Design a protein around this ligand. Structure first.
Ligand SMILES: C[N+]1(C)[C@@H]2C[C@@H](OC(=O)C(O)(c3cccs3)c3cccs3)C[C@H]1[C@@H]1O[C@@H]12
Length: 436
């Protein structure tokens, strides 16, 4: 009978169609919307590119492989198929690594990486990923039968020769899947917790500013980098003494772009830990929303834990949601008189709720990473765990389970473009305007 084989093959063909029309919709949408011409979208573009080539070639040739239960198109066809397949998938997981380190460096490195990232740099990183994936797999497959001497793969099958042993296969699974997964997992949980601090920075870049030399605040106080007050005394000799105390060497005045970035984070974390430690700042910080929190930090980042602890009547109104009543309550202080230009933008935040005074695009959690990673894990885990199982025995895993797990790794490339439309609304309207 085996008509179910033809039926299932048609389903996989349908699945392959959904994959290729889903990925080409992403490619087209990116090149016609103009509003999606950002860096992170270009990473999703290449991810869609890798899913496209693996959804138009790999899924089709594997369908015929399980259909006729053999490989009857020579050895070169099998070698080139597995090469392109593995490279594309390895470029896919490296791309996921790129995205993971992308918006993580956008957090930890506001100046080194975040303030220096173009579409050209993205193409280099992606291009580098494909080159690495190429060198790792393509010569390893092709030039292996020309290395040992004779081909192990018999006419009628199609697999990898240097993955004969289950030990070397499991080792590759660790270094190419388990290791990237744990990293992306660690990074993601260090993004979801540290996404609120990204916008905390842009406020301090407007108020305090950025400079490598040593200047003076809106009152004549020595400060280097991003709002880091070295000292309060009008003496330059002792000002640099505190500067070199934070760096580690004789800067003789000026610093670099990475040093200023480092000294910035040392004062922000000290402020936040200065809020939680303080008995009059901790309940206030926990009574405000995540958006109103950076505004409070801006006060602590400047005045200090003590300076903000001197506003008793003010902190009481913040907890009691007396925003407009606290807006005028903060307009009667030395801070509002000495450096008033920035105070107008801080107080406005406490009475409205949004940062329309500072403008700045809002950034909340990782809306894209959660979908694509969970999809990537759930789909590929039944295969890699099966490799772990296959390692400690032989006939413990049937060929059917290998084919299914191989297909589960294929639907990963199918769900990935669907994850794009199941998140951002800009991708939604662009997938809707198309096709008409
Ligand atoms: C979807 N794939 C195309 C197929 C199944 C998956 O296989 C895996 O997840 C593996 O750990 C292994 C494949 C083979 C031995 S260990 C990876 C390989 C490369 C990057 S991760 C991922 C890729 C890989 O080509 C196979």
């Amino acid at each position: 009978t085996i008509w179910q084989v033809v039926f299932i093959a048609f389903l996989t063909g349908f699945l392959a169609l959904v994959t290729i029309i889903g990925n080409i919709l992403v490619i087209v949408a990116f090149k016609v919307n103009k509003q999606l011409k950002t860096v992170n979208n270009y990473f999703l573009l290449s991810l869609a590119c890798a899913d496209l080539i693996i959804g138009v070639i790999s899924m089709n040739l594997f369908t015929t492989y399980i259909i006729m239960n053999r490989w009857a198109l020579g050895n070169l066809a099998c070698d080139l198929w597995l090469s392109i397949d593995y490279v594309a998938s390895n470029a896919s997981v490296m791309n996921l690594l790129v995205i993971s380190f992308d918006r993580y460096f956008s957090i930890t490195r506001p100046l080194t990486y975040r303030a220096k990232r173009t579409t050209k740099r993205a193409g280099v990183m992606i291009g580098l990923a494909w080159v690495i994936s190429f060198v790792l797999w393509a010569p390893a497959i092709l030039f292996w039968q020309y290395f040992v001497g004779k081909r192990t793969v018999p006419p009628g099958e199609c697999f990898i020769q240097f993955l004969s042993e289950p030990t070397i296969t499991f080792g590759t699974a660790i270094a190419a899947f388990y290791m990237p997964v744990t990293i992306m997992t660690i990074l993601y949980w260090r993004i979801y917790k540290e996404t609120e601090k990204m916008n905390c920075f842009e406020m301090l870049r407007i108020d305090e500013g950025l400079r490598l030399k040593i200047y003076k605040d809106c009152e004549g106080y020595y400060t280097i980098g991003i709002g880091h007050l070295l000292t309060k005394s009008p003496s330059l000799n002792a000002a640099k003494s505190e500067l070199d105390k934070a760096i580690g060497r004789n800067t003789n005045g000026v610093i670099t772009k990475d040093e200023a970035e480092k000294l910035f984070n040392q004062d922000v974390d000290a402020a936040v830990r200065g809020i939680l430690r303080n008995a009059k700042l901790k309940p206030v910080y926990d009574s405000l929303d995540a958006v109103r929190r950076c505004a409070l930090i801006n006060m602590v980042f400047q005045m200090g834990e003590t300076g903000v602890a001197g506003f008793t009547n003010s902190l009481r109104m913040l907890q009691q949601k007396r925003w407009d009543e606290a807006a005028v309550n903060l307009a009667k202080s030395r801070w509002y008189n000495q450096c008033p230009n920035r105070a107008k933008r801080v107080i406005t935040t406490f009475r409205t709720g949004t940062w329309d005074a500072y403008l700045i695009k809002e950034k909340k959690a990782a809306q894209t990473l959660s979908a694509i990673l969970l999809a990537f894990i759930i789909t590929w885990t039944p295969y890699n765990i099966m490799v772990l199982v296959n390692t400690f025995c032989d006939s413990c895993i049937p060929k059917t389970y290998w084919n299914l797990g191989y297909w589960l790794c294929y639907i990963n490339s199918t769900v990935n473009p669907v994850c794009y439309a199941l998140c951002n609304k800009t991708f939604r309207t662009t997938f809707k305007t198309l096709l008409l």
